Design a protein around this ligand. Sequence first.
Ligand SMILES: O=[SH]([O-])([O-])O[C@@H]1[C@@H](O)[C@H](O[C@@H]2O[C@H](CO)[C@@H](O)[C@H](O)[C@H]2O)[C@@H](CO)O[C@@H]1O
Ligand SMILES: *[C@@H]1O[C@H](CO)[C@@H](O)[C@H](O)[C@H]1NC(C)=O
Ligand SMILES: *[C@@H]1O[C@H](CO)[C@@H](O)[C@H](O)[C@H]1NC(C)=O
Ligand SMILES: OC[C@H]1O[C@H](O)[C@H](O)[C@@H](O)[C@@H]1O
Lengths: 365, 362
Amino acid sequence: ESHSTEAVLGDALVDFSLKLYHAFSAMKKVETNMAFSPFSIASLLTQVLLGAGENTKTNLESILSYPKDFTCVHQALKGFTTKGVTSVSQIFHSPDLAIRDTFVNASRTLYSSSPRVLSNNSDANLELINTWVAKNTNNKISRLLDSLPSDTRLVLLNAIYLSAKWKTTFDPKKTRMEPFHFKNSVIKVPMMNSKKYPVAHFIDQTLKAKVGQLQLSHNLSLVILVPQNLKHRLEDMEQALSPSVFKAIMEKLEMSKFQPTLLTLPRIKVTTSQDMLSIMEKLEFFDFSYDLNLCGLTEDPDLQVSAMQHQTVLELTETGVEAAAASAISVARTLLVFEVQQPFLFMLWDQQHKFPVFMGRVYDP
Amino acid sequence: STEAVLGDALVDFSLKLYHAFSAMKKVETNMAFSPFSIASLLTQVLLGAGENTKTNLESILSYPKDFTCVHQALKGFTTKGVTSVSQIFHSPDLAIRDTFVNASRTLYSSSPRVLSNNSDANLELINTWVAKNTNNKISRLLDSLPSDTRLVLLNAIYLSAKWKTTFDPKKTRMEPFHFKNSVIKVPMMNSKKYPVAHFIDQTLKAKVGQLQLSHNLSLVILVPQNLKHRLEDMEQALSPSVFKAIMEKLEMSKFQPTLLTLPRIKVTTSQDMLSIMEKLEFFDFSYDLNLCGLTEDPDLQVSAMQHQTVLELTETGVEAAAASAISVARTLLVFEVQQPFLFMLWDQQHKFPVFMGRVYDP
Ligand SMILES: O=[SH]([O-])([O-])O[C@@H]1[C@@H](O)[C@H](O[C@@H]2O[C@H](CO)[C@@H](O)[C@H](O)[C@H]2O)[C@@H](CO)O[C@@H]1O
Ligand SMILES: *[C@@H]1O[C@H](CO)[C@@H](O)[C@H](O)[C@H]1NC(C)=O
Ligand SMILES: *[C@@H]1O[C@H](CO)[C@@H](O)[C@H](O)[C@H]1NC(C)=O
Ligand SMILES: OC[C@H]1O[C@H](O)[C@H](O)[C@@H](O)[C@@H]1O
């Protein structure tokens, strides 16, 4: 019956994540930090897909990389949900718009929420939504929006942050201002260290890059892709990172073993809000502004997604669950390195379900 | 020819001193001393020894019979990487033979000095004289002299040489070291790629690490591998045979970029060497002392015999480090110095130990 679909969804999420990666890369400036959540965006879009028809249905399916009649997905996606994030995602809608019952049941069954309703005046809503996002993200994301349209009929939202932490704590006392290769200068940045941190790692020839997985709480890992030499730039690594490439990177990593290892990386501290309409368009999906068929969601025939915000917050500092083993006094028994000293690309990958929860990159902490 | 033979003899002598020094000193103490400069001072005295004292010194110093070349060889060995002072003083009532003073001048390029008249004038004389010719590194060689002093042997020495490769001072934090069974925090130097020749010796159960210094000197470090082995038991397992092999090995062993931590080495050790000579079973310097060659005077004894080593190895090097050591190029090789350890400061050219010692607590 289902089960099938954890695998199939898994694949589709990888493919989608890259699509977003590049589209995000594009909308952002050229040497910028970014972070976004393929999972939570895909789930929000998959919520919308539930009540899409004819064209909008086939077009979403296309974007999200789902095959035809992938009905199981809505269960599967709820099943995937990690407790290592706090992921909020409501469809709002104006009073003049009337939401179908058969949708609201299916939304409740499967997404355990349902479209909310906007107040009467435009200006009342902005405070509503920012309060509502703040409340259900425990104030991590307070201000999701700075404006709404005036004629707003259908708003999609998605705030998300990483609550998970490192399995293994980093000693804060062992965190100096060490060097990082920004642009062609060198800059000095807070950098975390452990003489023996547990690390699964290897080299990939195709990317010409160092791949480093680091364990986190809730069966999440952080996968880091740094180019090996400084002679390779990040941009050209991005453009060489196929979905086929990527999937092999993870199959490899699953076999690859965590071993005590000399570790430096920076404090990761990335927050990225993004008008996703721009992105959807960048992916060649224009339905959210014209020819939008959400029959399933509503009967109303003159329908368009007035706004679609995404926001990721992501801190990985020293704090871990478990304090480090054998005090890392020396580096006895281990003879391995992984240092992160130039701009790099990262997943935050679910190990259990084999898909990317977050994705991004760091040029400058 | 005698460079080889002297080389061997100096190794053997150095250990003999090591243990004797180990013995006179307390149990978990830093020490540092110079086998070369002590041996040379004793070899100066050997020049004018006769019958018994001659054969007994020869024995101690590990020289074979009729090793006449030695005095040249030893002068030839002298490194510019140290500042080594070593005078035989003597009182006015004692008369030094001419044939000695010429041979001393020829070979040791100095000659016995003479003491003032009153005991108390001499102490200031000698400490000034040692200060002057050691550029104030060793000021106060002595705190007392005997009263009836007739023959004083002295030897101050310090290491002027430095690391080939500088250590970054910015990269020197208060990191941990395993003193006693506690842990203490001590200034520790680091380089992600320092050039280091190293290996493991099973006999000692120890890490051996050579590090290059200026003037064809190296610093050889012997740390026990695990914390489970103590230093004391490593000392007692360190034969001359063991040691000589350690160096033959090291000569073949290659310097390679390597992850390095060690402490700041900062050791100064003054020592009444009579105590040592006795500890080595050489009693001539207080009775049955035959220095016919040095003097005709028949009622002769070495009233005092001081040694003093100063030894700083901090970050300062000749050459600043290559490729900035930004990351760790080629392989991860390691040598970390985090528990008490034993060291040579070894002449590579001539193959003998200039200094020897150990560090329990920086
Ligand atoms: O964990 S570590 O040794 O780096 O961290 C500090 C440490 O510096 C402090 O120890 C000493 O305490 C005196 C106060 O008398 C300070 O002058 C110095 O900071 C330090 O020499 C301890 C003491 O609370 O605090 C931290 O753990
Ligand atoms: C509610 O939704 C599920 C399918 O989404 C279905 O099993 C059930 O029949 C629905 N019930 C009602 C009252 O709509
Ligand atoms: C000086 O010393 C050398 C070697 O000991 C010797 O050849 C020479 O005869 C000595 N001369 C005198 C006058 O003492
Ligand atoms: O590298 C040494 C320098 O580091 C930092 O830039 C400090 O601001 C400066 O005062 C110091 O001398």
